[PDB]
Design a protein around this nucleic acid. Structure first.
Length: 723
DNA sequence: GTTCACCAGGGTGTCGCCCTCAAAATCCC
DNA sequence: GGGATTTTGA
RNA sequence: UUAGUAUUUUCUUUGAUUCUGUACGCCUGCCGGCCCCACCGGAUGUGACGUACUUCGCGAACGCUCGCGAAGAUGGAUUCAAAGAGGGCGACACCCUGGUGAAC
């Protein structure tokens, strides 16, 4: 065994006791199957049509809500967080008002299934709410930072500015933190940047504070972007980017005719100094070749040879030929060499202005080129996938078996229970219906089918009903002339025997898993709909076993180490260590050393816990916290540690995951505030749990922020704990 | 010969903050 | 007249 | 493979071992003459498009014969080993590419 499944198996077969404080839990889990478009490739056009029709609605409502957000942000905040008591326009929580305003008595785009729009607006409210409740905390924090700045800038920390010249930059803008906007935060962060750049520019007055601790008006950061703002941003293609870059470069080439011949006495000396000889870059190429060899013998009148060097830099017309003519914009090499040529054309074209030390006209002239080069370099990268999801709000069936929404899971089951189908019925065209009736039912307008559907009933989250959700396995009667789409599905045995045919939660033969909601996911490379992957994401729920009275006779202390990942030590209820031991660009950097190690140590932690039955003493780092989350999930899924709402409410003594903050000790026979490796560290972390048991303090709150009156306490305790 | 400030544009991750609808009541030809 | 739509919740 | 006597599928991944690793045409990129182009040339040994060949999935006639779509140095195959609960939106943290600035 020794495996996470086979160790959770032992943890379930752990007849400790049934704690009377056992609050019922629920285990939410998801089965992510793949529609088998390979077998049924005719879906791909249909599924993609539905998906791109629902993005049209998604963006329409999102943009409308953003326009209304900046127009009436107070009324918008009233709308989002409605309720049965505080209604907006006499409507309950967001979804009611969304349907009323957007999909009530409103025609839908051709090919859009108003069930898909209903689920869209159903799921919109939980994004608007997150936006609001993150903006609140942000606003508070950025108010703090603004307070700090305004209180130590232009008022309080002008002694340093008084020590030298440069009285004061422009004054900071006023930000109405009563109602702060993205625009106001933008124009304040702009001034923060201006003043930071001014401080770095005035580095001659001993203002080396870029990393030295002084001055530096901090930024206002963290303000959320209204939902959809950064999702469906227009972005930019390549051809447009290169066209705007070439327009800016040609502008500079044309206007550079005589800007050189304005002073050309010491300006040209600096021009030649900047672009002088050093895979040759565009800068290196032009500098080392064209000015170097066009100046000496030929082409006098520096103005005239400036035109010739710019003609050379702009001889990259052949690259424009390779792109526009035969071959496309998919050759990154040509695109990067053309963009570099344009950038250097501009950079050496504005050189006389740069030498003049304007930096204000120069910035204005290089803004078009700057933006164009940014949009070329940003369009050059595309390792991303466009993901759109359609959600079935639920899988419920009325008294007659007719569903309330547009999705169902079906099984064309065989006699031997070895050749079952497990497809998904989706309803999106007009006339697509199905019923969960009996084989002996006589339904009008519907024809039986070999499919067996898994509906649900109950769980209505209303005081009146407040039932317990229960599935319903009943044969599927489909419309003869208009059958709902069948999404062949594709999974593994390890995956279906977890959710579909589980020894104890077999969908068709045993009570267990409960249907939650669903999502049809499209995951396609941008602009490549025929390569789109499709998934069905079914959320199932369980009731976890009740907690157990952990009268542990042994404990498993576990601590991190260098020679060891997470060395472990098995003690009893009175310490006196019983046993000890050791546990355990993109590939090696992240995967090999994050996942393959965290997972192995986690299953080793379960192996130790279950084998010795002993609860885990674990400290209060991303791969440590992922191991902690996995242990929490798979102990809560055992009649053990009770998962807390949000990871803030860690009880510190919560079943088998008994959390103790520091160790801050040693085993030199006199403690601290050498022997073997972190094995003794885990010994002392377990003993420290035992000590804090007598002490009776909340180790979770102020795990390390407090040191006074604590460091000496454990120091003395271990200095005396030798009897 | 890199390291900081600011500016333009992307990419990769993790973290906030939210969610995992059933059941009527009402127009339909 | 079942299919589609609408409102609703602590 | 990663279930307990014992369950079906083909999913998304992650380690470790051994094998298999496509042709031409033209453009393009690197270098020299040359100084950007253009013509010359080297290696082309970095992109790209066009056409072929290998494999795969769906269809049409008799293991062959044809029509579409996918991939072909981040590929494919073997033998072990093992996770997975998903979605949404947005922010941060870091990195790459360019530019200006002075400081060292």
């Amino acid at each position: 065994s020794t495996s996470i499944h086979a160790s959770l198996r032992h943890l379930l077969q752990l007849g400790l006791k049934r704690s009377e404080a056992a609050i019922p839990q629920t285990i939410t889990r998801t089965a992510k199957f793949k529609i088998n478009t390979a077998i049924k490739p005719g879906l791909i056009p249909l599924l993609n049509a539905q998906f791109d029709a629902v993005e049209g609605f998604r963006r329409k409502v999102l943009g409308e809500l953003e326009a209304w957000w900046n127009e009436d942000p107070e009324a918008f905040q009233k709308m989002v967080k409605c309720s049965m008591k505080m209604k907006f326009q006499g409507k309950s929580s967001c979804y009611a008002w969304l349907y009323t305003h957007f999909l009530k008595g409103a025609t839908l785009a051709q090919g859009l299934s108003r069930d898909a729009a209903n689920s869209l607006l159903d799921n919109m409210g939980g994004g608007l709410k997150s936006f609001l409740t993150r903006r609140a905390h942000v606003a508070e924090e950025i108010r703090k930072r603004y307070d700090q700045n305004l209180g130590d800038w232009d008022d309080g920390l002008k002694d340093l500015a008084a020590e030298h010249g440069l009285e004061l930059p422009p004054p900071p803008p006023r930000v109405n933190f009563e109602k702060l906007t993205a625009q106001e935060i933008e124009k304040y962060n702009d001034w923060v940047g201006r003043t930071r750049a001014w401080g770095n520019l005035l580095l001659i007055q001993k203002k080396k504070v870029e990393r030295r601790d002084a001055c530096l008006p901090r930024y206002l950061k963290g303000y959320p972007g209204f939902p959809g703002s950064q999702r469906y941003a227009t972005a930019s293609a390549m051809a447009a980017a290169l066209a705007e870059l070439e327009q800016a470069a040609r502008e500079q080439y044309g206007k550079a005719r005589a800007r050189f011949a304005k002073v050309s006495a010491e300006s040209w000396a600096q021009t030649v100094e900047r672009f002088a000889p050093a895979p040759r870059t565009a800068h290196q190429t032009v500098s080392a070749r064209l000015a170097a060899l066009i100046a000496a013998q030929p082409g006098w009148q520096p103005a005239q040879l400036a035109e010739e060097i710019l003609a050379g830099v702009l001889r990259g017309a052949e690259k424009l030929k390779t792109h526009l003519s035969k071959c496309g914009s998919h050759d990154r090499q040509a695109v990067i060499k053309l963009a570099n040529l344009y950038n250097v054309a501009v950079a050496f074209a504005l050189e006389p202005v740069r030498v003049a030390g304007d930096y204000l006209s120069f910035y204005a002239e290089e803004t078009p080129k700057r933006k164009a080069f940014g949009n070329v370099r940003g369009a050059l990268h595309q390792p991303s996938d466009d993901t759109a999801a359609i959600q079935i709000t639920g899988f419920s069936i009325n008294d007659e078996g007719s569903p309330n929404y547009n999705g169902l899971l079906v099984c064309k089951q065989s006699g031997d229970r070895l050749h079952d189908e497990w497809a998904f019925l989706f309803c999106h065209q007009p006339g697509q219906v199905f019923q969960l009736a009996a084989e002996d039912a006589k339904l009008r307008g519907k024809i039986l089918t070999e499919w067996l559907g898994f509906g649900s009933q109950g769980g209505s989250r209303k005081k009146a009903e407040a039932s317990a959700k229960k599935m319903i396995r009943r044969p599927v009667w489909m419309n003869e002339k208009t059958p709902p789409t069948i999404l062949p599905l594709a999974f593994g045995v390890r995956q279906g025997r977890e959710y579909l045919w589980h020894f104890d939660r077999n969908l068709r033969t045993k009570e267990g898993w409960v249907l939650g909601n669903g999502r049809l996911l499209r995951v396609m490379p941008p602009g490549r709909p025929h390569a789109a992957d499709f998934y069905l994401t079914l959320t199932l729920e369980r009731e976890a076993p009740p907690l157990a009275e952990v009268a542990a006779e042994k404990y498993i202390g576990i601590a991190r180490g260098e020679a060891v990942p997470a060395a472990y030590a098995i003690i009893d209820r009175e310490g006196r260590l019983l046993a000890g031991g050791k546990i355990a660009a993109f590939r090696s950097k992240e995967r090999n050393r994050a996942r393959a190690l965290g997972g192995e140590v986690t299953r080793a932690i379960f192996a130790l816990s279950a084998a010795h039955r002993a609860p885990v003493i674990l400290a209060n780092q991303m791969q440590y916290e992922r191991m902690l989350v996995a242990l929490e999930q798979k102990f809560a899924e055992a009649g053990l540690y009770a998962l807390p709402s949000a990871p803030k409410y860690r009880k510190g003594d919560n079943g088998f995951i008994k959390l103790v903050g520091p160790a801050y000790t040693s085993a030199t026979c006199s403690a601290c505030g050498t022997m073997n490796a972190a094995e003794q560290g885990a010994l002392n972390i377990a003993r420290k749990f035992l000590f804090r048991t007598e002490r009776g303090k909340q180790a979770g709150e102020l795990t390390e922020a407090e040191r006074r009156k604590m460091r000496a306490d454990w120091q003395n305790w271990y200095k005396e704990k030798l009897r």
